[PDB]
Write a protein that binds this ligand. Structure first.
Ligand SMILES: Cc1cn([C@H]2C[C@H](O)[C@@H](COP(=O)(O)OP(=O)(O)OP(=O)(O)O)O2)c(=O)[nH]c1=O
Ligand SMILES: Nc1nc2c(ncn2[C@@H]2O[C@H](COP(=O)(O)OP(=O)(O)O)[C@@H](O)[C@H]2O)c(=O)[nH]1
Lengths: 733, 16
């Protein structure tokens, strides 16, 4: 059996060497058969097979045995993969010295040159002693696939990988704390590196692949508000094109655009509608996409009383004339208490065009008393153009469309402003983002470079709840997370004036969690019966407490954010003072942290960041740490994903011992349990949460989800202070 | 599949 090498030279097969590596990789794993792997891969060998191909074959062999019954194959495959990547980058298993590596990469143009200016060779020597390359042996197969696929520095054309996981982690840390005083700089670098290398803190895909390289584009979320004017419509559109070329998710508020038929310039023109403009936003969003579908996503918001709401509600409906359909954008309907009350009483809802009702739109977000006043006034005013619809009809039309597409989202505007970090009089929250978890203030532009406009941006990350022993571990973790992301806000580039304005003014952050499901599993709690309410309350109090502590400490050191005076925090108001009171009936856990000490310290020294927390979905970050995604229950014990190399399988964390503890997604009898946990989480979260709603046809008579049930769950969510609602999953069975 | 049947008399009691 002849073997061919990298230079294309022939050597004789050495089956004992292969076995050694397999043995190595298996160390410490349970229920994995080395022979099983050898049988399956040896049969595909042949005379003159390249060495790389042998590696791929054994890797896949291992990978194909991943299962619930033997989840440690995930690691057998992983380690084999890691081994192969080491040799692929360094030409041996052992990684080079940090300094040598960085020098080589800087010379090749793969790493930023500032790294060498910012740190001395002695400092790089010191950093090398922090690194633990044996941490590469703790990844799961799925995780290594992601790492190799979209994180590790590489040549996309030639397929060459230039680095390994541990250099990624150390250098990310290096970059983010490069402007720190020399007395504390490396202390912070080591602590952050440990956090992320031992999976305690999860960082977003953009940061993970970019920080350390020459780029400066790290923005993933941008919220744009569009005024009712051709200049603003053009500005918005221009802004989206710039941002989607750089991979940012976009949240667009286009609620002010006047309705179809409305007058233009007087009576010399009569509006064309919003649809046309919506279609213009869609092409802007998809402007940097392969073909015109792929990547670049956006969620467009509008009030429920808009005059064109019935046409807006069915924009993604897959059945209709092309000129009345904007299918490739998700929508977020904005509701408030008044609208829900009309439904409960079986009354009508009046539809108005924003241009015809002075003060109404603003009141909708910042003052519910004033909104009701104005709203009833204008209903009776006969000079105002309006339309009446039955609240049950509108809610069902909306819910039918949300049920069938899964992508018609809700946003409770009152909850977003009565319980938030911002003062609604000065900086109201009028929209959300792509995934409905960000909620930041925005101002319309009159031109792309308008400096008086405001585009919201948000930097994200997350805490791995399955990697901490006790909740007081979150103090260190919050320090590292806040400090690193605040440094990033000054590191990255801002293509549009208005976006820099918001980032430097308010320095807003969005830190959330991953691995919730696993966490609940190991504490013997479930989602559906209410058994996790108090633990969730305890857990989310810790997270918010320590995050505010971190941000507050940072403000002492480096000054609060410019526009800190527009926050409720500035007035001594806290998350615990404005939450939805109904919550008291479903959770009795006490506060365990000193919120009153903190209240005073915030008032006095302020916050570096106007917002700190936001619960977001995560697929890719969770994969790297073999964690359940965000706060959602797994759909099953094993995840299957498609790849060029083969089928990727990932087994939920500690399946061996917790299989009966988990509560799979379709096992829950309803949404109540989960909706209560979201409510409890929203007590303490600055922004919002990407809540889902899930329905299974086979649990209902005749396999049809009753509208009654859909409306009931909507109301429940409103009752416990839920700000937004993301996807609606319906089962395919 | 959904069953579009809304009972407004049942929802009316709900407290927001
Ligand atoms: C001029 C014009 C505007 N529009 C719309 C789209 C915009 O949302 C909206 C206003 O943009 P503009 O008409 O430029 O705004 P303006 O301040 O001039 O408005 P007004 O007419 O009240 O003085 O009108 C059309 O639909 N067709 C037209 O021919
Ligand atoms: N990673 C990533 N995030 C995006 C992208 N487009 C938008 N986002 C933002 O990223 C959030 C998704 O959560 P994140 O933790 O980044 O996801 P993950 O890292 O890809 O699993 C959304 O709320 C968006 O605002 C994208 O292409 N990739």
């Amino acid at each position: 059996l002849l073997v061919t090498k990298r230079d294309g030279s022939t050597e004789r097969i050495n089956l004992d060497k292969i076995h050694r590596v397999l043995d190595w990789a298996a160390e410490g794993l349970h229920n994995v058969s080395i022979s099983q792997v050898e049988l399956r891969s040896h049969i595909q060998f042949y005379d003159g097979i390249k060495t790389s191909d042998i590696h791929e074959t054994i890797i896949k062999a291992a990978a194909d045995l991943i299962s619930r019954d033997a989840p440690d194959y995930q690691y057998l495959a992983a380690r084999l993969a890691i081994f192969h990547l080491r040799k692929k980058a360094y030409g041996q298993f052992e990684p080079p010295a940090l300094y040598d590596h960085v020098v080589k990469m800087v010379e090749m143009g793969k790493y930023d040159n500032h790294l060498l200016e910012d740190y001395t060779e002695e400092e790089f020597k010191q950093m090398d002693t922090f690194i633990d390359h044996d941490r590469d042996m703790t990844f799961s197969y799925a995780a290594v696939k992601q790492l190799e696929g979209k994180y590790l520095v590489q040549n996309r054309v030639t397929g060459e990988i230039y680095e390994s996981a541990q250099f990624l982690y150390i250098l990310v840390a290096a970059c983010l704390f490069s402007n720190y005083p020399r007395e504390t700089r490396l202390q912070y670098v080591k602590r952050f590196y440990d956090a992320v290398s031992t999976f305690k803190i999860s960082l977003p895909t953009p940061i993970m692949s970019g920080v350390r390289t020459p780029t400066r584009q790290f923005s993933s979320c941008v919220l744009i508000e569009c005024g009712d004017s051709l200049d603003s419509i053009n500005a918005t559109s221009s802004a989206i094109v710039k941002y989607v070329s750089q991979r940012a998710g976009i949240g667009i508020n286009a609620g002010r655009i006047r309705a179809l038929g409305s007058p233009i310039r007087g009576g010399e023109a009569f509006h064309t509608g919003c649809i046309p403009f919506y279609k213009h936003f869609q092409t802007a969003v998809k402007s940097a996409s392969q073909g015109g579908v792929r990547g670049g996503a956006a969620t467009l918001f509008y009030p429920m009383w808009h005059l064109e709401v019935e046409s807006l509600l069915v924009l993604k409906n897959n059945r209709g004339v092309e000129g009345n359909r904007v299918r490739h954008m998700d929508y977020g309907v904005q509701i408030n208490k008044l609208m829900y009350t009309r439904l409960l009483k079986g009354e009508d809802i009046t539809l108005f065009s924003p241009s015809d009702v002075p003060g109404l739109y603003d009141a909708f977000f910042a003052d519910q008393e004033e909104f009701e006043r104005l709203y009833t006034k204008y209903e009776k005013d006969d000079s105002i153009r309006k339309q009446r619809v039955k609240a049950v009809e509108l809610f069902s039309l909306m819910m039918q469309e949300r049920a069938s597409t899964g992508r018609i989202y809700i946003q409770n505007v009152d909850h977003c402003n009565t319980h938030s970090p911002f003062d609604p009089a000065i900086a109201p929250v009028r929209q959300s983002n792509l995934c409905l978890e960000i909620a930041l203030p925005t101002k319309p532009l009159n031109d792309v470079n308008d400096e008086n406009g405001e585009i919201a941006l948000c930097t994200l990350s997350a805490f791995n709840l399955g990697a901490i022993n006790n909740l007081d571990e979150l103090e260190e973790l919050a320090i590292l997370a806040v400090r690193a992301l605040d440094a990033l806000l000054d590191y990255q580039d801002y293509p549009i004036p208005a976006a820099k304005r918001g980032a430097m003014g308010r320095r807003t952050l969005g830190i959330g969690v991953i691995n919730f499901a696993y966490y609940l599993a190991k504490h013997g709690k479930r989602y559906s019966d209410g058994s996790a309410n108090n633990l969730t309350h305890k857990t989310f109090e810790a997270i918010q407490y320590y995050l505010l502590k971190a941000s507050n400490e940072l403000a002492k050191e480096q000054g609060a954010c410019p526009w800190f005076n527009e926050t409720t925090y500035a007035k001594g108001i806290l998350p615990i003072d404005t939450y939805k009171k109904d919550l008291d009936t479903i959770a009795n856990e006490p506060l365990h942290y000193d919120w009153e000490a903190l209240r005073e310290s915030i008032k006095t020294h302020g916050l570096r960041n106007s917002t700190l927390s936001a619960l977001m979905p995560s697929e890719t970050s969770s994969q790297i740490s073999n964690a359940t995604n965000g706060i959602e229950p797994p759909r099953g014990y094993v995840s299957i994903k498609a790849s060029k190399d083969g089928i990727l399988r990932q087994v939920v964390p500690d399946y061996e011992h917790l299989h009966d503890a988990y509560e799979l997604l379709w096992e829950m009898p309803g949404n109540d349990g989960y909706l209560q946990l979201v409510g409890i989480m929203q007590k303490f979260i600055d922004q919002s949460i990407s809540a889902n709603t899930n329905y299974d046809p086979s649990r209902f008579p005749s396999g049809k989800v009753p509208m009654q049930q859909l409306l009931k769950d909507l109301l429940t969510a409103y009752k416990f202070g839920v700000k937004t609602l993301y996807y609606q999953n319906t089962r395919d069975g | 599949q959904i069953d579009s049947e809304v009972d407004t008399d049942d929802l009316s009691n709900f407290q927001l």
